[PDB]
Structure 1
Amino acid sequence: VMDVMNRLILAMDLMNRDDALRVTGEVREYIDTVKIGYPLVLSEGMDIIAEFRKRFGCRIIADFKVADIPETNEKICRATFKAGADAIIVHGFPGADSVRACLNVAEEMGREVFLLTEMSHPGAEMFIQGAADEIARMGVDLGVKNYVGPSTRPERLSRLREIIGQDSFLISPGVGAQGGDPGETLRFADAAIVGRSIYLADNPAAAAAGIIESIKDL
């Protein structure tokens, strides 16, 4: 599995190139894995991935929550990996064929797919939660090795970890701003995803250091 420094992944959702670069650089010594999503990509373009690679020694996870038909998912993955992304996050709710499409491109292109099972926000309880266990099982059957689960629901994150097994890699968002606790999250997830708690702080570096200091024994 990817070696995530300090088990901490930065969710860089700032929408300004200068601010995104400044903050990421300020926490460079604490994090070597950055999750870049559409807020930043749709604001600065896919070239932002290249810029981050040039400026920092950071791994890039493209959080595009791919959720289209197989044919379109394939094109999205190809474009994303072509841009230099190490991994891409895909939704499992659209079904096995849509996930397989992403897995095939990742295999062909030598990159990785992360399967988003349950989400961390309140609305996830409406439809996603009830399908989450099956989505995770589907991922295991498809050979998925990387997963995303909610830090906001410990009991659910724990169940997801059980389904995918100790060997699978699991990252979890919802830490900090959404209420998730770093330590408790890491009882099940390999790495915690943190956005606002870090990028909106007066001193991102101190915020990151604080989170890391709280999970030092872990």
Structure 2
Amino acid sequence: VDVMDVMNRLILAMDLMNRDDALRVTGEVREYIDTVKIGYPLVLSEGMDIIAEFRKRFGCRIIADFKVADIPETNEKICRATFKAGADAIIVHGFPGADSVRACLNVAEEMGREVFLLTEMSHPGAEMFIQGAADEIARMGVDLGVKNYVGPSTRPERLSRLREIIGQDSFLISPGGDPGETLRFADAIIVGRSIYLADNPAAAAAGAIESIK
């Protein structure tokens, strides 16, 4: 009850960098998805004012995938600017340590918003430093009372290890490895290209939600 409800357990990764395209696609799928993740490529290209535009046009929740990774004072300012622009939640790296995460939690508490802790990634290169730190980063989050987590699904069983550390109550989102395996552990899956590059995004979203069931 204390974590967000994501409609149909499906989050749109809106990774297009053009405002017209981003708004067009998002409008086509709003019947199916109430939660949209946007990142720096779009906001740097079009301005942070685009966040309020998504919310005012569509009434969707916005998660700012900004992978915040600075010192505490700077993290605080990034979070404040992002929440002031209307973001409901922000994604934060754990690798820079507990004080950097707490800075974000502080601003979220002040402003009534949410922090997601990114515990692990699974692109090539993640094996160098990230994967060996993942379990400790997750435990750091739990020890700090973090309730929302982002984890990779390339290895669904790792998603299980994460779920093991954070408990069943925490909110966990992940890209949608096989969605069937992923949804055993994640509360919602994140879907990008298969929807936003589709000839018919509405139909794509509708089909994804059916399979989720």
TM range (shorter): over 0.9
1:53-64 alignment, distance < 5 Å: 53-64=55-66
Structure 2 residue ranges without an equivalent (≥5): none
Shift of residue 206, structure 1, vs aligned partner: 1.6
SS of the residue aligned with 1:189? coil
Q: Distance in 1 between matches of 2:179 and 2:119?
A: 20
Identity rate of aligned residues, in percent? 99
Q: Which moved more, 1:201-210 or 1:162-171?
A: 201-210
Q: Distance in 1 between matches of 2:20 and 2:122?
A: 29
Report Cα offsets for 1:113-155 as digits up to 9, x if no partner.
0000011312212210100000000000001000000011111
Q: Distance in 2 between matches of 1:153 and 1:40?
A: 28
Preserved CA contact (<8 Å) 1:35 1:60: yes
Preserved CA contact (<8 Å) 1:182 1:211: no
Shift of residue 169, structure 1, vs aligned partner: 0.2
Q: Distance in 2 between matches of 1:9 and 1:121?
A: 20
Give the TM-score taking structure 1 as reference length. Answer: 0.95
Structure 1 residue ranges without an equivalent (≥5): 174-178
Q: Distance in 2 between matches of 1:142 and 1:53?
A: 30
Q: Distance in 2 between matches of 1:164 and 1:122?
A: 25
The structure showing larger relative contact order (alpha-carbon pairs under 8 Å, at least 6 residues apart) is 2
The count of aligned residue pairs is 211
SS of the residue aligned with 2:125? helix
SS of the residue aligned with 1:60? strand
SS of the residue aligned with 1:124? coil
Report Cα offsets for 1:81-118 as digits up to 9, x if no partner.
00010010000011001001101111111111000001
Q: CA RMSD in A?
A: 1.0
SS of the residue aligned with 1:125? coil
Q: Distance in 2 between matches of 1:182 and 1:30?
A: 17
Report Cα offsets for 1:42-93 as digits up to 9, x if no partner.
1110000010011102001011000001110000000000001001000001
1:30-69 alignment, distance < 5 Å: 30-69=32-71
Shift of residue 212, structure 1, vs aligned partner: 1.4
Q: Distance in 1 between matches of 2:116 and 2:70?
A: 15
Report Cα offsets for 1:20-59 as digits up to 9, x if no partner.
0000011111100000110110111000001001110200
Aligned counterpart, 1:203:
200
SS of the residue aligned with 1:81? helix
Q: Distance in 1 between matches of 2:30 and 2:70?
A: 34
Preserved CA contact (<8 Å) 1:117 1:148: yes
Q: Which moved more, 1:88-97 or 1:201-210?
A: 201-210
SS of the residue aligned with 2:64? strand
Preserved CA contact (<8 Å) 1:59 1:86: yes
Report Cα offsets for 1:181-205 as digits up to 9, x if no partner.
2222111000001111111111111
Q: Distance in 2 between matches of 1:146 and 1:93?
A: 16
Q: Distance in 1 between matches of 2:156 and 2:177?
A: 9
Preserved CA contact (<8 Å) 1:183 1:214: no
Indicate whether 1:127 and 2:124 are aligned. Answer: no
Q: Distance in 2 between matches of 1:215 and 1:54?
A: 28
Q: Distance in 2 between matches of 1:152 and 1:122?
A: 11
